[PDB]
Amino acid sequence: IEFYGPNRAKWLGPYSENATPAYLTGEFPGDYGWDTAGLSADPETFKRYRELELIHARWAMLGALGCITPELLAKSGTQFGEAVWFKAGAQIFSEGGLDYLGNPSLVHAQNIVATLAVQVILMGLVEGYRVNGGPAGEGLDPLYPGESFDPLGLADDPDTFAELKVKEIKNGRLAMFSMFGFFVQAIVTGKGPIQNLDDHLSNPTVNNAFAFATKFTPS
């Protein structure tokens, strides 16, 4: 319970090998000391990896919640068409464009190239202004700004803020691994991941994974 220090929860815990690599000893969230290949020995490259892992973690957490929500919402009390995240990307082609919430009173996007061009413009703008700063105060911190992106004001107390950092990083790692699981389920069985959830909860051991183990057999 001492991540910021030598007594962090190390990568093997009780098999910790307390001779840890000396280029990271606490002082940054998520430092769990698991460097078996050591591709981040250089400090500036290590900083790049911290920034890159933060970006990946936030994007993957957003994607993971985007993979949990719509299927459950269309399963409970709404209808989307194909709420499963496969053909949600092809809902613009089918009959009447991409109607949001499955309702012909919302977005109703007909042409995907317009979404395409506007998406490129907006994403270039926000990513450029993410790197070099810009609106809502010029960006002085590349990792965590501290400017008007926290309109609630939770970043006053430092140790709770650091705990929030560590929670953010751990959540991001879990999100990345889970989205990898989503992608592998997309490849192998190619069905709904929450359909997978319901089917495994209905079938705990009879259809586990290895009925779907003789599919990609070469011959």
Partner: protein, 201 residues
């Protein structure tokens, strides 16, 4: 300091230090300096939501869409039960900062991060201009709720029913009409009594 009836007095705590201070407080509500601090933003926010409601109430009755007193009655929207629960969480979150930013700074702003001015626009003597617009708008909203009343047509439809027409169909030739004449006659003779209170001191 142009008072609410031409030659008037000033109640002993409505001097000229407030913004829209036309010296009108006959029932002595804000006698504190602690509720003035609060009734000011009651005034500004109650007015401010109404200023944002008048635009919608006019456009929905200019363009088409079914009349506002039956707006949510029929609804092609989604899941009447739970979108109100959506309408609870974001709001209470927002209220935390509205009341918090009310507490920590002096009586002016509200948004989540700062006194909200992303522009360099007027933060000047013209806050009386928008509270003046607001106290106009609040009176404008009650009229529309009294048009969802007695006549049952919308704003612009009764606007056509009288406002290209003579004074043959107005308040006093309508359902709730004999009471308004009495209230006009009573309110008009009222500063004639308030002057008699303070002539004899």
């Amino acid at each position: 300091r142009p008072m609410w009836y031409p030659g008037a007095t000033a109640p002993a705590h409505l001097d000229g230090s407030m913004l829209g201070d036309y010296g009108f407080d006959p029932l002595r509500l804000g006698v504190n300096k602690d509720n003035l601090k609060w009734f000011r933003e009651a005034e500004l926010t109650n007015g401010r939501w109404a200023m944002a409601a008048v635009v919608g109430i006019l456009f929905t009755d200019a363009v088409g869409l079914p009349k506002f007193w039956t707006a949510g009655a029929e609804k092609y929207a989604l899941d009447n039960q739970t979108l109100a629960l959506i309408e609870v969480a974001v709001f209470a979150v927002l209220e935390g900062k509205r009341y918090e930013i009310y507490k920590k700074t002096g009586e002016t702003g509200f948004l989540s991060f700062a006194p909200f001015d992303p522009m360099g626009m007027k933060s000047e003597e013209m806050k009386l201009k928008e509270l003046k617009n607001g106290r106009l708008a609040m009176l404008a909203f009650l009229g529309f709720c009294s048009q969802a009343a007695v006549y049952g047509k919308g704003p612009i439809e009764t606007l056509q029913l009288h406002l290209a027409d003579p004074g043959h169909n107005n308040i006093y030739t309508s359902s709730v009409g004999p009471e308004t004449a009495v209230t006009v006659a009573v309110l008009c003779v009222l500063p004639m009594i308030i002057e008699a209170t303070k002539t004899l001191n």
